[PDB]
Design a protein around this ligand. Structure first.
Ligand SMILES: CC(C)(COP(=O)(O)OP(=O)(O)OC[C@H]1O[C@@H](n2cnc3c(N)ncnc32)[C@H](O)[C@@H]1OP(=O)(O)O)[C@@H](O)C(=O)NCCC(=O)NCCCC(=O)NO
Ligand SMILES: CC(C)(COP(=O)(O)OP(=O)(O)OC[C@H]1O[C@@H](n2cnc3c(N)ncnc32)[C@H](O)[C@@H]1OP(=O)(O)O)[C@@H](O)C(=O)NCCC(=O)NCCCC(=O)NO
Ligand SMILES: O=C([O-])CC(=O)C(=O)O
Ligand SMILES: O=C([O-])CC(=O)C(=O)O
Lengths: 435, 435
């Protein structure tokens, strides 16, 4: 009775019409200007893409189809006896724009359970990878290697009319989200629990729960952390590196597997999702240098040394946000409720009182406040997931939700190839006069 | 005596200063406006990035550091007894902006020969891949898997000061360009010449020549075709999908291996580099449907059927070009000189007289003229390289030259994270009033 595909079939034509008319009336309306500094500055401040699933406000933070994090916490269906929102429900919301029922949520969970399966070539590849090959690299290679199963790639090769692209994107998206946790978990076990198996999917559990089981964790609170983690990391508008990458790549009609893998290559950057890992490594050196309970003056010192060495302080700053990331706050609230006395948590809390001030003092960062990455690893470590080089994988798994939801829409709406004009410094100087 | 690294060490600081001053004077100067239609239209017509290596003119085609194709043909050093420009020389030009000497060119060739080597994990992976896994997917997975050797990734993890990034990018770039042909050729042999070996690199030959040897081709004209192919496919300004992808991904400080692999995922799109493959498959069905020597009326018919079925005609049209791609012309001239009587060539020639007109008649395409992809496979087929699903790999190998040359510069110049602002249809409607 529940079928997302049928819901979308109704939704698509209305949005098409709506955008059509809008463009009819405002296509030539200017929404902004481009300056030399924006071009040199990684398009900072440039309104450049249409991305429907979520929109980030510089002061208020992210909204998912118009809802804030607290709103989601409050509205989305939870697990039986749970407190944290099920990522399945978030997916529904991103895709349809509507809050799902628990019934709808359970369908998503079954669907994902049904579609979870890995081809042998992929298993073989993962099992043959060296342990010194970073987890994100293993993840991206595996997803790329899965493209042999692409239903979209297959339909395209058959000559499908462009109007049906969305339908095949939808299938691969659902298939890929379903397989993610199996891939991710196989990496975890191969690297850190050599000789054991991820086991099988329980068609009766939610996606997060099957995932934690494959990871080998039994604590129920951990399952709850996972559900939250996976929900809040899902999407962050379209201009962030990973999302933009999926967008750009999909625009050329590469299948979702290839688009998602390219995205992961972007998430793996130190200035992007790798920060979650970098924060923990930074904290480890800290505690190692100074030792467990540091004084504020010592913390300051340590921060300055980093800045003075031509490095960034991981987990702080943002290209768009101008205040503390609500994702950070949300994590803080979780810690406060569950592991208030953890020394690492306490360290993280202490830095919140210090880092921003030093950054302010330094005068370079536009946003001296923390971002999501400053608070995620600390939670993970508490539950026994101490493998910091693996943290980004979790982020990657989450992010699939947002980017794949948009991807369906991009093709439904007929968005064309992303192809802006570039310029050379010399050409630009000429364009103006030069300086 | 020749050392590109030392040359760049001198060049870098001057460019820095120059850009510094320019921005001082013109940073706030507006170079353009953004309209609703540009945002909905994949940034078409938006001046959005700085990319130094090459600049595309909509009428005149591509210029590499200010030189046109014919100019390069004429200025770049050739092989002994050769006619086509050595890609090594093109690389030098992109990187330094100066035409290299033959001596300089030979150094590049030695350097690339010296650095060529594959780690076992990568060889193992390639050898275990299934034959139904597309060549581009095999290629991207392999490059990603090579990141275990990244010198940049390693330095970053060591805390290197940001000012030295370029130095490590340069090393990985040279290493990666050197390994490309080994990877690419191993794929070719595994898929199409099962049981044979690529053999070893001859430190005495140019890069193209070692590549053709590993591919197993003996014809000297083929070596010449390769040199040309690899040179002309090298770069095409910064806003094309593959380049933009490398740019975006590298901007987050992902290493060159990861940035290049993501790019390949974009090149593999049917609207991008996969077109070279698609053109040949389209021609094969053509010849199959109609049979070898078709009438113009039949060709028209066949074209219309494609268009009427909601598909594109591969190899025609362009996001920026508005006239026939000089890369196409350059290939035509090659064919005319070497395989003037080939029936497929002749077919390709015939379509040039017909396709544009049909496209014009249809009234949708902005540019009814052919692009590079319409003429490349035909040349390859003539020499016995009939594996059309492999053609994009060649493109990928070439493209490494341009994107990696820019990548060094992006980090030298300190370009920040690419992170534009996105918008939702609803948010945008509000911003204006809505339509
Ligand atoms: C998130 C970043 C990349 C935003 O970049 P951008 O929009 O260019 O920041 P900005 O405009 O404030 O930069 C202005 C200057 O302050 C510096 N600065 C910014 N944040 C800084 C930080 N955390 N530490 C040190 N210096 C910093 C910038 O590097 C830049 O210096 P230069 O002018 O000398 O280049 C930046 O804040 C940063 O590097 N932060 C640390 C890395 C991090 O935490 N990344 C994860 C972010 C969230 C995410 O994507 N999660 O997945
Ligand atoms: C190269 C492309 C993607 C440029 O896209 P874009 O800048 O959006 O083209 P455009 O503005 O002319 O598009 C206007 C309309 O004409 C259509 N059109 C454009 N080229 C077309 C073609 N070759 N066949 C059929 N329809 C075409 C577009 O799809 C679009 O239709 P809708 O409005 O219904 O969406 C386009 O010309 C195309 O699809 N060409 C065929 C594929 C191809 O040859 N790709 C390789 C290009 C070069 C390259 O990257 N090599 O690596
Ligand atoms: O929004 C950004 O640019 C980066 C970020 O926090 C995310 O992708 O989660
Ligand atoms: O310029 C473009 O957009 C596509 C193209 O021809 C290339 O990348 O070679």
């Amino acid at each position: 009775s529940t079928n997302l595909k049928d819901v979308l079939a109704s939704l698509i034509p209305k949005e098409q019409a709506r955008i059509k008319t809008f463009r009819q009336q405002h296509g030539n309306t200017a929404v902004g200007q481009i300056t030399v500094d924006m071009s040199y500055g990684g398009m900072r401040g440039m309104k450049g893409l249409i991305y429907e699933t979520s929109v980030l406000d510089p002061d208020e933070g992210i909204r998912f189809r118009g809802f804030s994090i607290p709103e989601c916490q409050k509205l989305l269906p939870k697990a039986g006896g749970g407190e944290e929102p099920l990522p399945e429900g978030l997916f529904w919301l991103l895709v349809t724009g509507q809050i799902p029922t628990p019934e709808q949520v359970s369908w998503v969970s079954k669907e994902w359970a049904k579609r979870a399966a890995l081809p042998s070539h992929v298993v073989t590849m993962l099992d043959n990878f060296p342990t010194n090959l970073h987890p994100m690299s293993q993840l991206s290679a595996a997803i790329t290697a899965l493209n042999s199963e692409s239903n979209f790639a297959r339909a395209y090769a058959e000559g499908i009319n462009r109007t049906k692209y969305w339908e095949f994107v939808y299938e691969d998206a659902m298939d890929l989200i379903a397989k993610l946790p199996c891939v991710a978990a196989k990496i975890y076990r191969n690297l850190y629990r050599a000789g054991s198996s991820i086991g099988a999917i329980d068609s009766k559990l939610d996606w997060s729960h099957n995932f934690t089981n494959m990871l080998g964790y039994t604590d129920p609170q951990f399952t709850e952390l996972m559900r939250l983690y996976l929900t809040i990391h899902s999407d962050h508008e379209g201009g962030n590196v990973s999302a933009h990458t999926s967008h750009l790549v999909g625009s050329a009609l590469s299948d979702p597997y290839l688009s998602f893998a390219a995205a992961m290559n972007g998430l793996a950057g130190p200035l992007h999702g790798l920060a979650n890992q970098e924060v923990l490594l930074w904290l480890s050196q800290l505690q190692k240098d100074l030792g467990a309970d540091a004084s504020d003056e010592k913390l300051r010192d340590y921060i300055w040394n980093t800045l003075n060495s031509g490095r960034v302080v991981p987990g702080y700053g943002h290209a768009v946000l101008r205040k503390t990331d609500p994702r950070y706050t949300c994590q803080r609230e979780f810690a406060l409720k569950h592991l208030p006395s953890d020394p690492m948590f306490k360290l993280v809390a202490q830095l919140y009182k210090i880092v921003p001030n030093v950054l302010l003092e330094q005068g370079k960062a536009k946003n001296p406040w923390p971002n999501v990455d400053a608070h995620s690893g600390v939670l993970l470590q508490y539950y026994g997931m101490t493998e910091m080089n693996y943290y980004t994988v979790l982020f990657g798994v989450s992010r699939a939700l947002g980017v794949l939801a948009q991807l369906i829409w991009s093709r439904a709406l007929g968005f064309p190839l992303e192809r802006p004009k570039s310029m050379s410094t010399a050409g630009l100087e000429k364009l103006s006069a030069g300086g």
